[PDB]
Subunit: 126 residues, 5 copies
Amino acid sequence: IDCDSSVFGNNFNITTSPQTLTMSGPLAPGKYQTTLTVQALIGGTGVVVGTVTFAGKTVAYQVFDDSFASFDLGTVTVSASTTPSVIWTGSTGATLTMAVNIICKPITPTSVAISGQPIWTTPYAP
Amino acid sequence: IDCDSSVFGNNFNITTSPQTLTMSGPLAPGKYQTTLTVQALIGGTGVVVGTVTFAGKTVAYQVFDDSFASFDLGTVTVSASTTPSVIWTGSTGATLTMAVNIICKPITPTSVAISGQPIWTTPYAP
Amino acid sequence: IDCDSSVFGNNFNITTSPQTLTMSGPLAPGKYQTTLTVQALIGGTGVVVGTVTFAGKTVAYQVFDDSFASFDLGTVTVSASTTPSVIWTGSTGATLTMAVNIICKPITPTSVAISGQPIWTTPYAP
Amino acid sequence: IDCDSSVFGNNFNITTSPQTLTMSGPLAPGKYQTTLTVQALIGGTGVVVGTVTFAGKTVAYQVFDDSFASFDLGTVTVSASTTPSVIWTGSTGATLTMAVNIICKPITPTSVAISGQPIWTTPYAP
Amino acid sequence: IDCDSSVFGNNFNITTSPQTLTMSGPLAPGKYQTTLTVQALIGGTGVVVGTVTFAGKTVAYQVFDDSFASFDLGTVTVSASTTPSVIWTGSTGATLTMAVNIICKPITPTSVAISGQPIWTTPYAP
């Protein structure tokens, strides 16, 4: 019935302000709820600050040792179908592996079940 | 359809009790559901306690090594449009990078789908 | 419209079985959904087990290095308005900083939107 | 109104395949939504794999350094009232403290609020 | 009433691109909401990137020290009953233990309670 799209990428760090075109993501033509998961291991004893821009949105990201963070982001529109992509900034280096996942869902009406019948009603406005 | 606002900031630590005006946040004029994500890497082998005040609300924050914490916070009002900002306190130092993100959503009615029709009803009050 | 109460505390460790009266929490007179966030940094290379009692409820808590854990706890009543407070137990020591946050929400009806109109109904019971 | 039951335990590791009867848990007679929180600190520089069986369900668990994981588990039945208990397996040792929490909730109808009145309806089937 | 299926596995690392047939998972014949939990401890001082493919879906995974990550994934269909299984890729080695859990739920209508009766309605279309 309902659909899904988890577009994803596994990347590296070199230039400040780089794009990362997202792997194997064909399109997200319609409306969607959206989420980010991000984490990045560090080569050596160094700490890394950074920020992640997706679609007019931006996210803070301190790190050292082990990390994992997620973000719900409500109901992003897609005005016209395109490939997913992510711009971001922060310190880069010889070794600082990156892992980033976008998950987006179609918005659908929720099914419901009614309790307490019969249910009161009047023609008149409240 | 629905809107969103993830206002954000990436900062440092010097004075006790400082404000951090939040980056690139124009306004949040209406009612909103709200959330915090906070994490802060440590320069050197030191641990840091701290607390974060947003809007009449305050949050505890122990840390060492790697950290990441989030908080749902229900339905904050915005009486009049302003720039987002965050006051906080705790130990500061030569190196203790900070990363903080606010995400807020408009509150909207949820769409629903009805199951089990036809549905019972009576004019009379229960 | 809807209200909120994030009562909070930032504390230390000395005696077994201590109370910690919670900072700046005036009252929670009515019914509420509730949540805990807890984390505690360790002075030195030591591990700490502990348990946290709130309101007839109790929570397990292993720790070393960095920690952060959260708990939803459904719909706690408040029979009469009081100050928030937390009892707990476990190993204590020279340095083991504690951070604990309670977040509670009023329970309110959810707004809804109806899909699929017109909606079928019959006077007769199913 | 609504009830709750957070049954809990703080334990050790010796035999493979042990039970841990859960502390201070009197009964859960009816239907319930359920959740696990598990974490276990390590004595020494060692890593621990393990799995946790609850009620016909089983859970994977790698660990080293600091850990914390949670699991929603939908709507477990309780055919007849009993004490909570947990079987599990994996490497054990001289020091590997365990912390495990079960939280379960009664399933109740959700209250709702209606938007968009008046609402269309027809006697005829769709 | 409602059912559940937490199929699971605890594994090792050798070849690139291996399958892991999932332990003790008999079938998931119908429609389901789905979730992943993944974490993997590291033998030695090494970091590991990897990606996890389930059902036409793929997930990023940086790691070092301690890790734990989870993913909601909406409403996966099961066209015909089969055993659960997971393909994945990344660096492998002498010691890099893996822990992976799938949790899936039947999709069911939600029960509801009505507030604000009596409820307005008109025969006429809006």
